[PDB]
Design a protein around this ligand. Structure first.
Ligand SMILES: [Ca+2]
Ligand SMILES: [Ca+2]
Ligand SMILES: [Ca+2]
Ligand SMILES: [Ca+2]
Ligand SMILES: [Pt+2]
Ligand SMILES: [Pt+2]
Ligand SMILES: [Pt+2]
Lengths: 68, 71, 71, 71, 71, 70, 70, 71, 67, 71, 67, 70
């Protein structure tokens, strides 16, 4: 009945959707009761060749197990 | 003499935020016939226990009120 | 008990944001009798190709929900 | 459901913002019963010339948009 | 005339945010007397070294200034 | 040098500019120091007959005199 | 298509609408496809005599044309 | 020169937002001694299919960062 | 060094990503030096046949040469 | 019953935003000894007509209400 | 009377004040009427060896001159 | 590449810059890939003697790794 909230950033060369999804799946590997991920910010990183990386910051909350 | 109402509406899709937006815009157009702009207010995802993702988006749209229509 | 609905409306005017706002409020009062305040949320101008300006203003108002009005 | 309606509503109470919010939610649930989350947008108090306080709260709620339901 | 001053004030209580607000509004009403609405701007808690909580709330109120009152 | 900041509301049946000018002139009654007023918020009161009052909240700042309260 | 966004400030002794109109016209003298100007901020400057100038900041967008720097 | 860690946590309770906030403070103090302020970030309510309400509240807390353990 | 910051809008019938990349590619035509573009706002234009245009407003910053 | 006033104040300095803030706080403390925290709200610079910069900073401070600081 | 508004970023190895001073002085090379610069955002770049650059984004306005 | 983002507060009697460098330095003890720190909030504490402590809240992000559990 008490949850930790954290922000994470996903990235992808394909889409904000895939960057988000990757980040949520990685989070689920280790905290395992994420129900909602809220989009906080979106941006793009760009290199000199013009390759774009889509980056997305998400807020996810998870039930804290009786631990520190 | 033109007064508009503004509402928020949410679309959802397994595919994308663009698809979730398009669903909500289509449903709004079935109710009113002068929507020209829909602004993105918030985006999120819902994740079910099996890890299936649904993309969700809240849009703000305005449309001209008809005389006598309720608030 | 008493519960209220809040909505956002946009008035428009070739003259002023005050006139656009008064038009929106008067239209609102044609439907509900209990509006005593209207908060300004946003203002803009639309411009056509001749340069004719329409002042536009988004207002938030609230009013009592009547039970015989479906949500 | 691919589309959800969103509305903002205000509840009031002489006793708590929690009561003001529960009343607003329960009144909305009378009309649409799949409301699962209500977000607090704004809180205030009205104070009458005797000093009597009314707690007021504005909530945003969403629910599946029905066929033939206005936006 | 009819110019108002707008100020923020914080009330505190071990019991609730509503009581902390009531304390602040009652205190303000004995100095300035035409306060009709108090808006909640921020809420927090102070926790002491023993773990006792003090709920604290920042409110915005406006009151009519006397014709000659300094700023 | 240190400046006090205050927020004030003016009102008018006619315009927000008048509402603002009224608030600003009242401020100028006890301080020759006001050079900018920022609009923070705008609304209208509407009475039962539907008469409108435009109201506007402004922020002003001015030098703190060594004997004034904050 | 791709567009440029800019903020501009108009001023007037008369009204925020006139300040805004004036800035918009100025903008339109250079580009023909401004369709909306969003109000971002309003303020007033006030001189030592208490004379008021209404000032308004607006955000406008227009199609960027080859003969146009960023 | 000291460094502090900042985290956000959410408490919940069927009773009130004050109680939801106290549950989250209690849980935080099980791990750290020196939380002294908890700022309210957001409040909402979750409503189950039976109409039962749970009050939820997101708090931001800071405390001394110790050389061990995570940023 | 000193950088200029500008806002630009890209549009696409396909996606906000395509609208953004269009806008960034065009910016890098006038100044190759852009490394990040932050999304500021997103919206859609909808015509009377219900055809959607996705639009996105980006902030970019670049080394001021001027020149 | 413990109620606090909140005010905004601005300090200025040709040297730094730190010195600007410190000047404001020191002036505030000349009147009210118990100010312990000041939050930065905004920073800017005023620039004169041959390039001299003045750093300015707006701070928010709170302190227990008292009749020598009416409001 | 009409004014142009722009955002600019300055950097410094030593302070946000100096980073700001630099951006303001660079703007003044091009325009004469700048009277206020508002701070929008502050950040720091940090290289792989731990060296810090203070960066600041300012908004400035000035009268827009003919053409 | 998935990153974690956290907020951290540095303090210093010297300046907000030095308070920021303190928090950045401390974070570098834990992770090595921090390249930018964004300022979120600034404040000061002041003691009864007028001694000031500058405080600054920074947001930083770094690639996820076992030693920095979520
Ligand atoms: Ca309560
Ligand atoms: Ca006007
Ligand atoms: Ca997409
Ligand atoms: Ca400094
Ligand atoms: Pt220790
Ligand atoms: Pt008093
Ligand atoms: Pt891990």
């Amino acid at each position: 009945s008490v949850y930790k909230v954290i922000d994470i950033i996903g990235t992808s060369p394909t889409s904000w959707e895939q960057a988000a999804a990757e980040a949520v799946q990685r989070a689920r590997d280790s905290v395992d009761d994420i129900r909602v991920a809220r989009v906080i910010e979106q941006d793009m990183a760009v290199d000199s060749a013009g390759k774009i990386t889509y980056r997305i910051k998400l807020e996810v909350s998870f039930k804290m197990r009786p631990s520190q």
